[PDB]
Paper text:
O-glycosylation of the protein [name] by the mucin-type O-glycosyltransferase [name] (Txg) [name]-T3 influences cyst wall rigidity and stability. The strict glycopeptide-preferring enzyme TxgGalNAc-T3 then adds [name] to acceptor Thr one position N-terminal to existing Thr-O-GalNAcs and is predicted to sequentially O-glycosylate Thr rich repeats within the mucin domain of [name]. The structures reveal a unique [name] binding pocket that dictates the substrate preference of TxgGalNAc-T3, which is coupled to a 2nd metal binding site that is strictly conserved among apicomplexan homologs.
To investigate the basis of the substrate specificity and function of TxgGalNAc-T3, we solved the x-ray co-crystal structures of TxgGalNAc-T3 in complex with [name]+, a non-hydrolysable form of [name]-[name] ([name]-2-(acetylamino)−4-F-D-galactosamine disodium salt, [name]-[name]-F) and each of the following glycopeptides: [name].4, Muc5AC-3,13, Muc5AC-3, Muc5AC-13, and SRS13.2 from 2.2-2.9 Å resolution. The catalytic domain adopts the conserved GT-A fold and the active site contains a DXH motif (Asp276, Ser277, His278), where Asp276, His278, His414, [name], and a water molecule coordinate [name]+A with octahedral geometry. Thr-O-[name] at the +1 position on the glycopeptides is bound to a pocket in TxgGalNAc-T3 consisting of His333 (catalytic domain) and Glu554 (lectin domain) that interact with [name] via sidechain H-bonds, and Ser334 (catalytic domain), which interacts with [name] through a mainchain H-bond. [name]+N is coupled to the [name] binding pocket through coordination to His333 and indirect coordination to Glu554 via water. Loop II flexibility and the interaction that occurs between the Gly319 backbone carbonyl and an amide group on both di-glycopeptide substrates (Muc5AC-3,13 and [name].4) allows TxgGalNAc-T3 to accommodate and modify substrates with variable sequences. Thus, a role for the lectin domain in activity enhancement through interactions with a distal [name] on a di-glycopeptide has not been shown but is consistent with the lack of electron density at the C-terminal Thr-O-[name] in the co-crystal structures of TxgGalNAc-T3 bound to the di-glycopeptides [name].4 and Muc5AC-3,13.
Residue numbers in the entry:
A (entry chain A): 103 to 628
B (entry chain C): 1 to 7
Amino acid sequence: EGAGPGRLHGRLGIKPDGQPGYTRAPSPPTDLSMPQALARGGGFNLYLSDHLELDRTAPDARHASCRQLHYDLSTLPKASVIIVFYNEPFSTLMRSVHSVLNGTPPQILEELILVDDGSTLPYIREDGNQQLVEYLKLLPAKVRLIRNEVRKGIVGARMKGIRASRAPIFAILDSHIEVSPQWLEPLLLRIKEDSRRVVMPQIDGIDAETFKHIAGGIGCKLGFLWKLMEHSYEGHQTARLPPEERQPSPTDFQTSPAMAGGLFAANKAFFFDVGAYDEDFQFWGTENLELSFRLWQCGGVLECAPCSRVYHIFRKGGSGYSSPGDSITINKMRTMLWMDEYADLAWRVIGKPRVNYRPESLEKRREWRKRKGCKSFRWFMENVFPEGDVVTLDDVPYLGPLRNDKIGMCLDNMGWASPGHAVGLEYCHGGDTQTFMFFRKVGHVMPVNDDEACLQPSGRLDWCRGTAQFWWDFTSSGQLMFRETKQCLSAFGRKLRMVECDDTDPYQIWSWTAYNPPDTFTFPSV
Amino acid sequence: TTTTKKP
Ligand SMILES: O=c1ccn([C@@H]2O[C@H](COP(=O)(O)OP(=O)(O)O)[C@@H](O)[C@H]2O)c(=O)[nH]1
Ligand SMILES: *[C@@H]1O[C@H](CO)[C@H](O)[C@H](O)[C@H]1NC(C)=O
Ligand SMILES: [Mn+2]
Ligand SMILES: [Mn+2]
């Protein structure tokens, strides 16, 4: 077919009739309640998605320096792109396919593997209307569909795709994305030089409501929160980088402690030698951190390619599928195997859960870790993520009730550890709603169940920032002194007010349990 | 079932 710039595999989805194999929809109805449409489409507007062409032009989100780079497609190795999906609408899934095929040279694209993770939508089912399979006949033979007869989850489906890939390199993409030009060449070139590099593109945004292409998505340097979820470097963390790295060139690759997950390229052979995925992970969540920690610890390197840009629909006001509530908690328990003594803090943050994390299966993972020679999480913190606020557990000197003995009451998050509400005073009962922890590097006073919520002298919790707005000092006499104003927190009259610091005033004296975790985290029973 | 966009 007619191949050229913008259609590197030719004109896609055209019948012998000469008409598209896909009938676009009319403009979305004017009487459209965006919240309701964000539900029908599982987190994005399917009315507008269905109206938009599959050969959708996207702006080049790449910095001008990236286009001045040349690539030799005859020296690069081929790559198998793997898109897995569970109940993804037709318009988004097939626009992701068109974007890849249209924006990836055939010289470097071995195959495009579609992995149906036990979908139930009629347009996907094998006993359905055959919409997808019939439409795949109108696409290159590179494109291949394989199926999990029962939904296994992200890890289950990505393994089915990876194991089936035949290229030495594989690239995983979500099923609701659009690429910027030359998205794959920077990844291949980087892994060609060292097979131990797992390289992830910079992610951009497609608005779930309007489908506008947005410049900034996720970025490069990514840390993690103690709720076990990736977290982009905040300003005070970038400030801790070596000065030669606080503002790198738009083309230089950068290392990242963590990845966003599902958008990374890797040498197939090294991916299996470094542990692949923990296939006892369930459905959705946290496999990106288990992979990130295991990668750095066991001889791998995680890098971000600022010149490899992919647009991504971040779901808003909705969700595309339903995961069991306990599957995420399990995945976090299995991830804590790689955090060594630090699992005590993470386990306390996610609420001291007692779930079935397949303990027998995790012990075989422990053995694998020792036999591979993987390094500790302390090494990881001190050498991979040394800019975090908790590098050793000595950075968390307090964890427990903040109790004022005068009135005999503890601080209480009042049910919502989430930011934006007021702290209170209540009779102490020991529950997690009354435990607070202290991050000394930023003077943050947080509820143990959310390290994004910080105490403020206003008496209310708010989003944590590494600035003087949130810095507290805990004096040797028991005072909570807001450093910026040198005023102390008082519990006088069962209200929280800032007063002039006087260590002879019992209403501003607080007791706070010291955090002295054991050298080893002993998992809870089942 | 959602990873959030960087601020
Ligand atoms: O049980 C599942 C859950 C998710 N997915 C797919 O895994 C990818 C990543 O999941 P999701 O899109 O929810 O993560 P996000 O990137 O949107 O935060 C998507 O293409 C999903 O269709 C899957 O194949 N099986
Ligand atoms: C996504 O947003 C949430 C909001 O609480 C967290 O800040 C999380 O760490 C964010 N993820 C990234 C990649 O920054
Ligand atoms: Mn996604
Ligand atoms: Mn933060």
